[PDB]
Design a protein around this ligand. Structure first.
Ligand SMILES: Cc1cc(C(=O)Nc2ccc(N)cc2)co1
Lengths: 300, 237
């Protein structure tokens, strides 16, 4: 188990660690989060009590270094940093544990939720989507726009998701205009899976990472990307059976976890009704369709 | 954006543009089989592509052989239309290529957009207008070349005859649309009107009769009346 210590908590803030979130009061004696499961990526994330605007946060993996949080009063936010002096880090963590000023990552032993939501997400791929190579962790917030969004303004602070565009020369082979637009299998299997992503794990990892940024930060372009990647699969007549079955599991946990009150802003009526009811894969997402119809029949 | 009553004069500026209408592309007669089931038989169709400023019509004839062995013809028809319009644009010198293509049914936007991906600078637009181009097969000479075709074929017409020697393209397009609306509302009456006086003939190289200025005014008034009168009865005035 790993720890992310906090130098202090000078401003009132709601702190999130993956699906768990807790309130910290202005100058409450809070010094971090312990018992964080090793083996998965994680996201810590903040919403200042004063400004519900700008939820932001940091993806990280505890195997890639010793990380801590420290408020910056010039820039006005909780900043993640790396401690390179490993002896200094163990010493600090131990003192804070002894004095019991850390919350425990509160995982129930039955609960595979976080794993199911991050199965294919890898830090190495996150750092390619969020470019900032001097840090081992990656910052995201509500307002960051995507590379495709910038094509339709600061390229350094963007989400470099893979561009998917159904009405593009990439998507559409000359002479198969109708065939390729109505059955996207060529674009899915050859262009994207074999050409760009190399395998379905990498494809699913971007898809889960887009969902997670949409759900935790309401990053509109992330939500756009998640729906695009679902639609590309659903609108392909020929998809390996193992991908379909995995996709049903992925989406199932995403819908299970999605907060009920953000379902109107995070779910696209058109994409879901199409994927569940019109697409080639309309009979291939049994678990997803069952949960969608019992939890959000209003959308459908 | 969409074309409607308010950006109507844009049709007659000097930006090249085409209307594409696909309503006569896939045509069928419905009939009964020996067993008492229903079956369709396709008949020749045509893509109606018109430059509203010059009158030039590019009538792409769609021979029934192009449907042989195909499924979901109504859907294929939209893609076939887009394919042919795209070939037409590509066949034209650059300086004659359109800057806009206005489709008369929204179902054509996506098929045309996909086929025109190589022309990012050509705007594909819908319209809110209820234009009567479907009545083009009520024009005897156009119907005749469509029905006689034995292979795919493109035929070129000027749908305003020589009108532009005397009227503006705005006035020409208004005349054409009144004639076609009339033909769509009541074809028999519309045609009786046009041909009653056997002394006013259709030149061999024309589609409509050789009326004088004053005779067009009378004709135009008669087509307005006929169109009035079925609005005088369809909504029980
Ligand atoms: C505008 C907006 C607020 C939020 C939000 O708070 N998300 C979130 C936060 C925590 C958890 N567990 C789950 C989801 C998303 O969009």
């Amino acid at each position: 188990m790993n720890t992310v210590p906090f130098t202090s908590a000078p401003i009132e803030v709601t702190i999130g660690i993956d699906q768990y979130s807790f309130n910290v009061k202005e100058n409450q004696p809070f010094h971090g989060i312990k018992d964080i499961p090793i083996g998965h990526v994680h996201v810590i994330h903040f919403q200042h009590a004063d400004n519900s605007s700008m939820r932001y946060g940091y993806w990280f993996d505890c195997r890639m270094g010793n990380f801590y949080i420290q408020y910056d009063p010039k820039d006005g936010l909780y900043k993640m940093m790396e401690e390179r002096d490993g002896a200094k880090f163990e010493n600090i963590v131990h003192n804070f544990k002894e004095r019991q000023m850390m919350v425990s990552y509160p995982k129930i032993d039955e609960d595979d939720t976080w794993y199911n939501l991050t199965e294919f997400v890898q830090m190495d791929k996150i750092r390619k989507i969020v470019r900032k190579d001097e840090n081992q962790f990656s910052y995201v917030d509500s307002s960051m726009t995507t590379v495709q969004e910038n094509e339709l303004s600061d390229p350094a602070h963007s989400l470099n998701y893979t561009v998917i565009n159904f009405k593009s020369r990439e998507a559409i082979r000359p002479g198969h205009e109708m065939e390729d637009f109505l059955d996207k299998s060529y674009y899915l299997n050859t262009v994207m899976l074999q050409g760009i992503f190399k395998n379905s794990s990498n494809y699913f990892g971007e898809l889960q990472f887009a969902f997670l940024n949409a759900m935790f930060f309401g990053n509109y372009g992330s939500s756009l990307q998640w729906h695009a990647m679902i639609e590309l699969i659903c609108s392909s007549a020929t998809v390996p059976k193992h991908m379909l079955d995995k996709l049903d599991e992925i989406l199932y946990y995403q819908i299970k976890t999605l907060p009920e009150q953000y379902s109107d802003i995070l779910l696209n009526e058109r994409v879901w009704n199409i994927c569940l009811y019109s697409s080639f894969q309309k009979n291939s997402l049994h678990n997803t369709e069952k949960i969608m119809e019992n939890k959000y029949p209003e959308l459908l | 954006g969409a074309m409607n009553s308010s950006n109507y004069a844009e049709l007659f500026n000097n930006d090249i543009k085409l209307f594409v209408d696909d309503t006569n592309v896939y045509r069928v007669t419905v009939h009964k089989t020996f067993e008492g089931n229903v079956a369709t038989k396709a008949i020749n169709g045509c893509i109606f592509t018109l430059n509203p400023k010059t009158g030039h019509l590019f009538l792409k004839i769609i021979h029934t052989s192009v449907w042989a062995g195909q499924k979901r013809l109504s859907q294929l028809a939209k893609w076939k239309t887009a394919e042919e319009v795209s070939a037409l644009v590509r066949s034209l010198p650059k300086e004659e290529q359109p800057k806009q293509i206005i489709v008369t049914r929204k179902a054509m936007l996506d098929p045309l957009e996909v086929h025109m991906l190589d022309f990012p600078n050509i705007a594909i637009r819908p319209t809110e207008l209820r234009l009567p181009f479907s009545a083009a097969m009520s024009i005897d000479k156009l119907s005749d070349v469509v029905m006689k075709a034995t292979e795919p074929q493109m035929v070129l017409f000027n749908i305003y005859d020589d009108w532009l020697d005397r009227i503006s393209s705005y006035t020409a397009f208004s005349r054409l649309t009144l004639l076609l609306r009339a033909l769509k509302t009541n074809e028999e009456s519309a045609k009786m009107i046009l041909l009653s006086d056997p002394t006013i003939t259709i030149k061999s190289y024309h589609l409509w009769p050789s009326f004088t200025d004053e005779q067009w005014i009378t004709i135009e008034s008669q087509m307005r009346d006929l169109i009035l009168t079925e609005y005088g009865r369809k909504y029980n005035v």
